[PDB]
Structures are given as structure tokens and as C-alpha cells.
Design a binder for this molecule. Structure first.
Ligand SMILES: CCCCCCCCCCOC1OC(CO)C(OC2OC(CO)[C@@H](O)[C@H](O)[C@@H]2O)[C@@H](O)[C@H]1O
Ligand SMILES: CCCCCCCCCCOC1OC(CO)C(O[C@H]2OC(CO)[C@@H](O)[C@H](O)[C@@H]2O)[C@@H](O)[C@H]1O
Ligand SMILES: CCCCCCCCCCOC1O[C@H](CO)[C@H](OC2O[C@H](CO)[C@@H](O)[C@H](O)[C@@H]2O)[C@@H](O)[C@H]1O
Ligand SMILES: CCCCCCCCCCO[C@@H]1OC(CO)C(OC2OC(CO)[C@@H](O)[C@H](O)[C@@H]2O)[C@@H](O)[C@H]1O
Ligand SMILES: [Mg+2]
Ligand code: NA
Length: 223
């Protein structure tokens, strides 16, 4: 059937759902491979982060979408790793597509991460285990800052902020390495490593340009 949902990416080894539900006074977290156990949180009056790792499980993605009222067109986008980053506003929910690097001491993998803010839930969809969101998990666990007091829109902002922070750290590491090569480090191979890094840097740099543009120009317009 043409309408068949297809995962377009290359990761198929992991599957797991992690739920963190909290309010100013409490917090409960669990991991499960049973999707039926996370569906009840749909109607939660308090914020719930539902992190679905392994979107190759198109059956799980479809079940979550059907229960939460996600449009099939959005499930196609979640499953298509060639989507562009975006924020899109549906009558009853916000849909966001992001990209995220996974780091390990060149070379660096890229993975798409989608978010849906619906009612009081942030649904997160990842391709494989491993992400940049631990700082947010810890602030929830240990009741740091104000995240525990705020609603699910703040959870959404906090997760995006964690990804922004990761990119800025990543650009800093890329710059420190280019420097190391530029002033140090036989010569012909050293130069081609540099090229590799300056290209990766060119890929990430637009994020900083978009953010700096918003930061500089919006606030005064708001006044
Ligand atoms: C649209 C909805 C969602 C929006 C979410 C909000 C996005 C927030 C972006 C801001 O994060 C940063 O704030 C800085 C200041 O402008 C940074 O400079 C800095 O980077 C550091 C972190 O390593 C520290 O050395 C200092 O805080 C230093 O000011 C930079 O790191 C960056 O991470
Ligand atoms: C990268 C950019 C991302 C931008 C994200 C934008 C976030 C938008 C959410 C803000 O507005 C809302 O916040 C709620 C909790 O999350 C609400 O609960 C609600 O408020 C109501 C009563 O006023 C009713 O409409 C419903 O019960 C509804 O769920 C409702 O105010 C909703 O519109
Ligand atoms: C604050 C939010 C982010 C700010 C900074 C934005 C950084 C640049 C974003 C662009 O990323 C992409 O560019 C495409 C196209 O321009 C993609 O679609 C596509 O997939 C391809 C490659 O994956 C292309 O070959 C196709 O033409 C097709 O359009 C897609 O992969 C996506 O990753
Ligand atoms: C407000 C926060 C917003 C955060 C989101 C915006 C991030 C800015 C874009 C940077 O990340 C990319 O998107 C890809 C798709 O995930 C890439 O494709 C890739 O580049 C390659 C070429 O070497 C392959 O090796 C990789 O596997 C991979 O598919 C990756 O290079 C880079 O273009
Ligand atoms: Mg689409
Ligand atoms: Na991941």
C-alpha cells in the first residue's frame, strides 16, 4: 500500500520508551518497551516527557500517533530523516523537527529528533539510544532551576535549549581543533583533516547565525 509508513533512516538496533512525569511536588520516571503503558499519560494534567527511541518501529510510532491524534502526514515527517528543521503549528499541537549530533572523541553521527507538544505532553522521537538531553533529565530528577514548576511548553523550550548548548559546545571543540592544526600539528595529511573540520563547521554555523539574528533583532521590535 502506498500509504504505508516507512522509516527512511539507517538505525534499527534500539527500541525503548522513557517516561518522566512531574509537577512542583513530585516526579516519576520509568523505561518500557510496552507502548500501551505510556498512552495513559496523554490526558495527564501535569507535564510528561515521553521519549520514544527507535522510530524504525513504525508500528509503535503509528500507535502513538493514532492515540494522540497526530496527523498521518506528521508521522511521515517524523519517519523521514531528510526533513528540514522546522516548527509547524497544528490546531491542537506543535510539531518540531531537529537534528542532533552524537559525539565520540571526526567522526560524528547525525540523527533526526522530532518533538510534539500536545496537551501537557512532549512526545520525543529519536532514531537510536544516545542524546544531549541528560542535563534536562537531571534538573527534573533533582529539582534544579524552575523546570519542575513550569508547564510542558517550558519542557519543550528546555529540551531545545539543551540541543542549542550542545551545538555551541561542539563548535567550540571544532574551533579548538582547527587551531591545534593551524598552528601545529607529514604536512599534506594535516591540511586535509582541517578541510574536514571546516566543512563540518560550515554545516553547523547557520544555527548560530539564525540564533544570533533572532537575539539581536527581535527584542527591540518587541519594544
Ligand atoms: C525558540 C524556543 C526555544 C528557545 C530555547 C532558548 C535557546 C537559548 C540559547 C542561549 O544559550 C546560550 O547562552 C549564551 C549567552 O548568550 C551562551 O554563551 C556562553 O556559553 C557558556 C556555556 O558553555 C558559558 O561560558 C556562558 O554562559 C557564556 O555566556 C551560549 O553558550 C549558549 O549556550
Ligand atoms: C519553537 C517554538 C515552539 C513554540 C511553542 C509554543 C507553545 C504554545 C503553548 C502555549 O499555549 C498553551 O499552553 C498550554 C499548556 O501547555 C495550554 O493549555 C490549554 O489552555 C486552555 C484554556 O485556556 C484550553 O485552550 C486547553 O485546555 C489548552 O490545553 C494552552 O494555553 C495552550 O494554547
Ligand atoms: C533554528 C533552526 C535551524 C537553523 C539552521 C538551519 C540549518 C540548515 C538546515 C537545512 O537542513 C536540511 O536541508 C535540506 C535541503 O535544503 C534537507 O531536505 C532534503 O534532503 C536532502 C539531503 O538530506 C536534499 O538532497 C533534498 O534536496 C531535500 O530538500 C534536509 O536534509 C535538512 O537536513
Ligand atoms: C534550535 C536548535 C535547532 C537544531 C537543529 C539545527 C541543526 C543545524 C544543522 C546541522 O546538522 C546536520 O543535519 C544533518 C541531518 O541529520 C546532516 O547530514 C549528514 O551529513 C553527512 C555527510 O558527511 C553524513 O555523514 C551524516 O550521516 C548525516 O546524514 C549533518 O551533516 C548536518 O548537515
Ligand atoms: Mg512531509
Ligand atoms: Na538518539
Amino acid at each position: 500500500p502506498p500509504g504505508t509508513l516507512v522509516y527512511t533512516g539507517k538505525y534499527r538496533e534500539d527500541f525503548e520508551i522513557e517516561v518522566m512525569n512531574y509537577s512542583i511536588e513530585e516526579f516519576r520516571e520509568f523505561k518500557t518497551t510496552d507502548v500501551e503503558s505510556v498512552l495513559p499519560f496523554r490526558d495527564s494534567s501535569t507535564p510528561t516527557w515521553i521519549n520514544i527511541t527507535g522510530i524504525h518501529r513504525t508500528d509503535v510510532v503509528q500507535r502513538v500517533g493514532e492515540f494522540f491524534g497526530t496527523h498521518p502526514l506528521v508521522l511521515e515527517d517524523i519517519l523521514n530523516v531528510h526533513q528540514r528543521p522546522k516548527v509547524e503549528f497544528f490546531e491542537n499541537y506543535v510539531f518540531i523537527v531537529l537534528k542532533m549530533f552524537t559525539y565520540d572523541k571526526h567522526e560524528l553521527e547525525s540523527e533526526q529528533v522530532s518533538l510534539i507538544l500536545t496537551k501537557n505532553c512532549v512526545l520525543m522521537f529519536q532514531e537510536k539510544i544516545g542524546d544531549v538531553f541528560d542535563p534536562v533529565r537531571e534538573r527534573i530528577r533533582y529539582n534544579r532551576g524552575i523546570i519542575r514548576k513550569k508547564r510542558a511548553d517550558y519542557l519543550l523550550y528546555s529540551l531545545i535549549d539543551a540541543l542549542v548548548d550542545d551545538y555551541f559546545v561542539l563548535l567550540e571543540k571544532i574551533d579548538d581543533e582547527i587551531d591545534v592544526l593551524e598552528e601545529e600539528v607529514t604536512v599534506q595529511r594535516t591540511h586535509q583533516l582541517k578541510r574536514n573540520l571546516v566543512e563540518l563547521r560550515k554545516t553547523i554555523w547557520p544555527l548560530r547565525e539564525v540564533l544570533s539574528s533572532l537575539y539581536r533583532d527581535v527584542p527591540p521590535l518587541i519594544e
